[PDB]
């Protein structure tokens, strides 16, 4: 699996599984771009913003940013401490490090501004300037994780071709995601 219902919120297990699928696809079709790219585990992305600097530096060592051109971080607003606050929203941070002097973290949030506080924390930990980037806004209460996953896949397609990072025209498909995870 893990399988996903028609209106089910995505968990970290769904996001990580699609990121593993994508990581394997990219290393097959574009191994050079795949070596330059990190699809960061959502749990490791939360560790990156930990108030414990020893936990954050461990997470940094797993991400290996110093050799990456692009970091894709799913951003959850789950609490660091409260077992009963496991998150309400997913957004996407793409950190472009190609210019090692002006790294930028593009924040794609399908509810604009929702996760901006956490996005700024992550960008600071990654030595990037935060910039809100356009993505189609969600039209229901359950698809933010699908925006994160399909936005990631669309950005990967655009990075392979030379560019346009405007995701206002993003078309998402929960159906295609459920098929990917179920197969």
């Amino acid at each position: 699996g893990p399988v996903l219902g028609p209106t089910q919120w995505l968990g970290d297990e769904h996001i990580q599984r699609d990121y593993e699928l994508l990581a394997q696809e990219l290393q097959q079709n574009n191994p050079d771009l795949a070596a330059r790219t990190r699809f960061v585990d959502p749990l490791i992305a939360q560790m990156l913003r930990s108030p414990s600097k020893e936990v954050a530096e461990r997470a940094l060592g797993w991400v290996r940013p110093g050799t990456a051109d692009f970091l894709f971080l799913p951003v959850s607003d789950a609490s660091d401490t409260d077992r009963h606050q496991r998150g309400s929203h997913w957004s996407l941070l793409l950190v472009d490090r190609r210019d090692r002097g002006r790294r930028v973290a593009y924040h794609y949030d399908s509810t604009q501004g929702y996760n901006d506080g956490l996005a700024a924390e992550l960008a600071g930990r990654l030595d990037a300037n935060l910039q809100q980037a356009p993505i189609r806004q969600q039209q229901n209460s359950y698809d933010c994780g699908v925006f994160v996953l399909d936005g990631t896949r669309e950005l990967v397609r655009r990075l392979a071709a030379r560019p346009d990072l405007n995701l206002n025209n993003l078309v998402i498909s929960r159906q295609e995601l459920r098929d990917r995870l179920g197969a």
């Binding site: 919120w9 970290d12 585990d41 749990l43 939360q46 560790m47 108030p51 797993w62 660091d80 077992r83």
Partner: protein, 75 residues
């Protein structure tokens, strides 16, 4: 043998385990001390999530290793 589980806040949980212990067994041991149900836990070692069915020895986790605990996410 002794292993350590590090929390997102940097707190250290000390567990007593065997190499034959499954990851699920380890999560139960965390529940025994912290009260967190296993279904909420994820355990990470060397950047990889640990599957409930494998043992510590499967992942080459040896005495005094540190694992990282991150609770499940949803959105």
């Amino acid at each position: 043998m002794q292993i350590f589980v590090k929390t997102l806040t940097g707190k250290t949980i000390t567990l007593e385990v065997e190499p034959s212990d499954t990851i699920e067994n380890v999560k139960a041991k965390i529940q025994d001390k912290e009260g967190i149900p296993p279904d909420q836990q994820r355990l990470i070692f060397a950047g990889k999530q640990l599957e409930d069915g494998r043992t510590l020895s499967d992942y080459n986790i040896q005495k005094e290793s540190t694992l990282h605990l991150v609770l499940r996410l949803r959105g």
